[PDB]
Target: Putative phosphoheptose isomerase
Amino acid sequence: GMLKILATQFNGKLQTLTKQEDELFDVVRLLAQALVGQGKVYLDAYGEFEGLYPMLSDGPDQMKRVTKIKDHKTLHAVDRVLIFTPDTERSDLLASLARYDAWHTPYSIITLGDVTETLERSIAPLALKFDKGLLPAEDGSRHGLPSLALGAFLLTHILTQLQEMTEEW
Amino acid sequence: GMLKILATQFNGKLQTLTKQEDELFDVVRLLAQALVGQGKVYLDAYGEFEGLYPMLSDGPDQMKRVTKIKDHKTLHAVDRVLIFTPDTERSDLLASLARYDAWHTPYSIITLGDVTETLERSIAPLALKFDKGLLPAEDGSRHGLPSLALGAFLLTHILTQLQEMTEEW
Ligand SMILES: [Cl-]
Ligand SMILES: [Cl-]
Ligand SMILES: [Cl-]
Model:
């Protein structure tokens, strides 16, 4: 029934992410640059993706020097920002990107939507194209969208890959 | 190919869940009982699962009468509580179950751990047995635990099923 359809459709998306291992490794590499020095990685999450924050403070793959973005803290060129956002039209995201640009702080943007001009400002972008539901209906509408689940899965991957790199040092 | 390995490990768990469709239906039916009357469904999430809260307020499958548990608010027998917790040993969890018991409010407990006496206090429990990493290390230790991802996937399923049922009415 619904559980099996949702699970199999969700896994379909996980499999197709394998085709973008390189773009995801570009994200990891960008972030790892902070950790080779005395920079920090900051997660700056928007909307529903604010649910990612407890993964860094309370989660099983948490790590020192990967932390929640702090309002009003000036970042520096050695720091790196990981952004998860539902879309790139948000005014709060735009204000943050203007700040990072002024600080010369690089950022990876992971968007639930498609590729946009704003997304292209990121040195390590990823367009998930996963902003519509997985269960189609009668009228052309769709529902059942495990969007936070996808982001959380990706953050687990990123954290695990970063920690694996760090241990190798 | 870390990404593909984590994806396939995670999917292995998704596949075993789909064989527990009946226990998950027990969760959904218990919660749906609130929606027949004037009661509400409350999410009471612990530890890393506090990351689920933004799904109810900002997520794609949000619905009016499924909301975050409120501090100090006395619930009634027509309300329903959905709990996600890393384990059933937490003193805050036990203190909450004592309150719900005093108020005669039914609760569903989804635990990342195994079946316990405390879990069996729930009329609709689910033990995820998903509290150790998916990627073994030389240590014997395990890393890469997409625990929030699983929780978020399950909340999407529950939200989407409650909405489909509510529409049928
Ligand atoms: Cl600087
Ligand atoms: Cl009552
Ligand atoms: Cl026990």
Observations:
- The pocket of chloride ion (ligand 1) is lined by residues A 76-77 (CB under 6 Å).
- The two ends of chain A are 47 Å apart (CA to CA).
- Chain A touches chain B through 46 residues (CB under 8 Å).
